[PDB]
Design a protein around this nucleic acid. Structure first.
Lengths: 70, 114, 101, 88, 271
RNA sequence: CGCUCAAACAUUAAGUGGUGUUGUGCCACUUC
RNA sequence: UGAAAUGCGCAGAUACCGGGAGGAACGCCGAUGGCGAAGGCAGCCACCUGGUCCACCCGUGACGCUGAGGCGCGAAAGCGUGGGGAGCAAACCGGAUUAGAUACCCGGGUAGUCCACGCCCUAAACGAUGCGCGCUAGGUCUCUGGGUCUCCUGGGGGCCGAAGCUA
């Protein structure tokens, strides 16, 4: 389909406060998108996950959303 | 309990039965059906046709309660899964919106010997 | 002496007399264990992502200080006691790692 | 950890000539700080066996360097062993 | 933890005694308003209401500030972790800058020289005493009141404590040194932290004597006696219980509940 | 019709047991 | 559950909403991946800490390698003392199966699994490959560090194969 990273701008992937930004890797499922959807790299991928959970404890990034229509 | 408009049906699909419940927009069971509210016993209850009959039964009694518009939230993985919803189409009850909220742990309690 | 990004959340369902009575206890608290307040932001109430304490709102604070590390724990410890202080997360501050530079 | 500036304090008091950061002196003295630094840690961190591995390794290396520094020039060794209060 | 012994003698290849490394090099109890005479091997009529007592060691009671509210917000620098021969725990002779000196059960985590104090404005900090309303949920806490202005009397044994489960109404829920989830009025005082000498349970008396020094007399078994004395009276060979195991007064002895049905305190306890 | 038994018989290459079914009183394991 | 039965349920169960207690374990990331001497190691936060890698060619100046004995670490089960106990669970009882079923399958179930402290010191403790160093074509995938970089240069994990080795 498309690359998430290739829809945004220049963003520090360590500010666990920019929800709008981070949330875009969260999936309409609440699951930390796999590598082959976000289009990240090794290094990058892990610290992204870092500041993810870091912000999930701040009620900022949803843990899980029951799937929509089915 | 009272005759109301909106609502919400709950598909609990096991593997040796499947159950559901009509419940007011608050979350409290108005009516409910299963594989045994169908008569079929044992394994029969793991059946889609049993599920059709379940949903039909469930929703059926809702329409006797003035029920019309109902949301949907299902859990499990029973052979009557989708079927418990597709019966809820030819039910006359507006499937206002269907949703899946099957329980799934971040992995914690160690599982039975299977 | 090290750089940290202390985080906090507040009970959203309260005024500004008790709220400006609350922030002062984090102040008094910090200065107790030598915390040197730097660039402090405040994003107040916030439509939370999952219900905490049954209220989907939480008044966010955010600090960033230089302080003695061997007491960085006992700073956080202190912070949580207030029953109106819901969330507290101390972390060590770090450089902007770039993404899509 | 060990402050880089209180680390230079070490080389300074052990450098057998400015511009020196390799003399077995500076090396022994070094490991010692790391040793005792690590010794103390494990004192109240007894469970940390992992870390004890190192405590042996840093010691071996120090005991080795001390072998040579004694085997080559004895007089200098005597002065060191005392400054560091070792060999007990 | 505890001092063992080489077996230079039987009843001494098991018997251990606590390492009083916690005691603040102190023997003389504060002769001050602290130690007063103590006695009584049996009840007021010259009778016996508790088999097997006496033979003590001649003891002085140590007055203990349990209420601790008559001195709110008056800081008292700790002075002494003392031995007290009337509890599972040590005592802590504290001194207030008010001059006057008192005594408090020695909690776990008590060094000598803490700025401990009573009252609610006091920091929820080990050794500090305050009403539960101010102590957050989960906080461990000893020497607990039961009804306001009445005094502590819960969790006062070595290493015993109560945890706070939550608030409900004007009461707070405690999981007692037993797991009894009971409500207790908020305005009741406590003492943040658990109790000291927790390491005491692991003692082993060792010999008869040690028992006696305590005052516990030799307790003679039921079936050792005669049909005249005790229900188990058969004594006809090491012979079994007639059934069902029972007290020297007849009441069954295993699993017979005895708390009175309708003590008005039931409505204040769960499980 | 259901229930217990000692045989004739049937299932297997064979054995064993089981069982099937009549008669009677009321697929498993093994082949030196 | 292959079908059931024991089991549980008009004591109002199953399913559902809300509140609380409790324990253990960390979904997605997450992997052909990382680290560790080995055993082994996954929420996150902090502190304490070992090892390790690259660049600079600055420092000492053969101070190295191995290593009987000794010393320490050492999955799991197990053992002592105390705490803890939701889930799982030998043993244990029950249902079925079976000629029999101490088993497979199912319902229930205790020690244990978890914590501290101590002991235990075993193993398909497996790469079934002791360690250190020099030498002998390359291709490709990945992890990681440096370098103006469709490329070289170190380190680590795989596959394929020069030479050679091999029963």
């Amino acid at each position: 389909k498309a690359k998430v990273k290739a829809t945004l701008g220049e963003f520090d992937l360590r500010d666990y406060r920019n929800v709008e930004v981070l949330k875009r890797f969260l999936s309409e499922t609440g699951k930390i998108l796999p590598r082959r959807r976000t289009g990240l790299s090794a290094k990058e991928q892990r610290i992204l996950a870092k500041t993810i959970k870091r912000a999930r404890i701040l009620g900022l990034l949803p843990f899980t959303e029951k799937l929509v229509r089915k | 309990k009272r005759q109301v408009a909106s609502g919400r049906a709950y598909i609990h699909a096991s593997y040796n039965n499947t159950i559901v419940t009509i419940t007011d927009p608050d979350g409290n069971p108005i009516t409910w059906s299963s594989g045994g509210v169908i008569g079929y016993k044992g394994s029969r209850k793991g059946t889609p046709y049993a599920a059709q009959l379940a949903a039909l039964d469930a929703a059926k009694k809702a329409m006797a309660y003035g029920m019309q518009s109902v949301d949907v939230i299902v859990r499990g993985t029973g052979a009557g899964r989708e079927q418990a919803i597709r019966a809820l189409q030819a039910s006359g009850l507006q499937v206002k919106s269907i949703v899946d909220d099957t329980p799934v742990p971040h992995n914690g309690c160690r599982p039975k010997k299977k | 002496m090290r750089r940290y990004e202390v985080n906090i959340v507040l009970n959203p369902n309260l005024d500004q007399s008790q709220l400006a009575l609350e922030k002062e206890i984090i102040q008094r608290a910090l200065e107790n264990y030598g915390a040197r307040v730097e660039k402090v932001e405040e994003l107040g109430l916030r439509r939370l992502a999952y219900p905490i304490a049954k209220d989907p709102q939480g008044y966010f604070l955010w600090y960033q200080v230089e302080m003695p590390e061997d007491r960085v724990n006992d700073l956080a410890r202190e912070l949580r006691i207030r029953d109106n202080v819901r969330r507290v997360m101390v972390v060590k501050s770090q450089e902007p790692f770039l993404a899509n530079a | 950890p060990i402050t880089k500036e209180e680390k230079q304090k070490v080389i300074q008091e052990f450098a057998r000539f400015p511009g020196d950061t390799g003399s077995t002196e500076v090396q022994v003295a070094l490991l010692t700080l790391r040793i005792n630094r690590l010794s103390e840690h494990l004192k109240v961190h007894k469970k940390d066996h992992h870390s004890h591995r190192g405590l042996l390794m840093m010691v071996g290396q120090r005991r080795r360097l001390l072998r040579y520094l004694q085997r080559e020039d004895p007089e200098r060794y005597r002065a060191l062993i005392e400054k560091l209060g070792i060999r007990g | 933890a505890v001092k063992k012994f080489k077996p230079y003698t039987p009843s001494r290849r098991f018997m251990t005694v606590a390492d009083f490394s916690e005691i603040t090099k102190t023997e003389p109890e504060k002769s001050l308003v602290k130690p007063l005479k103590k006695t009584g091997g049996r009840n007021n009529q010259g009778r016996i209401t508790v088999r097997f007592r006496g033979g003590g060691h001649k003891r002085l009671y140590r007055i203990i500030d349990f209420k601790r509210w008559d001195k709110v917000g008056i800081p008292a620098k700790v002075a002494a972790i003392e031995y007290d021969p009337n509890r599972s725990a040590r005592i802590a002779l504290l001194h207030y800058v008010d001059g006057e000196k008192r005594y408090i059960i020695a909690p776990d985590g008590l060094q000598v020289g803490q700025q401990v104090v009573a009252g609610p404005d006091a920091p929820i900090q080990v050794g500090n005493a305050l009403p539960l309303r101010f102590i957050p949920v989960g906080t461990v806490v000893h020497a607990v009141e039961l009804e306001p202005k009445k005094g502590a009397k819960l969790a006062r044994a070595a290493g015993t404590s109560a945890q706070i489960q939550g608030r409900e109404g004007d009461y707070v829920i405690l999981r007692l040194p037993s797991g009894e989830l009971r409500k207790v009025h908020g305005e009741c005082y406590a003492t943040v932290g658990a109790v000291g000498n927790a390491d005491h349970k692991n003692i082993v008396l060792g010999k008869a004597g040690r028992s006696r020094w305590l005052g516990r007399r030799p307790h003679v078994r039921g079936a050792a006696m005669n049909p005249v004395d005790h229900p188990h009276g058969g004594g006809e060979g090491r012979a079994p219980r007639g059934r069902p195991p029972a007290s020297p007064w007849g009441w069954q002895t295993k699993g017979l509940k005895t708390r009175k049905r309708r003590k008005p305190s039931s409505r204040f306890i769960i499980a």
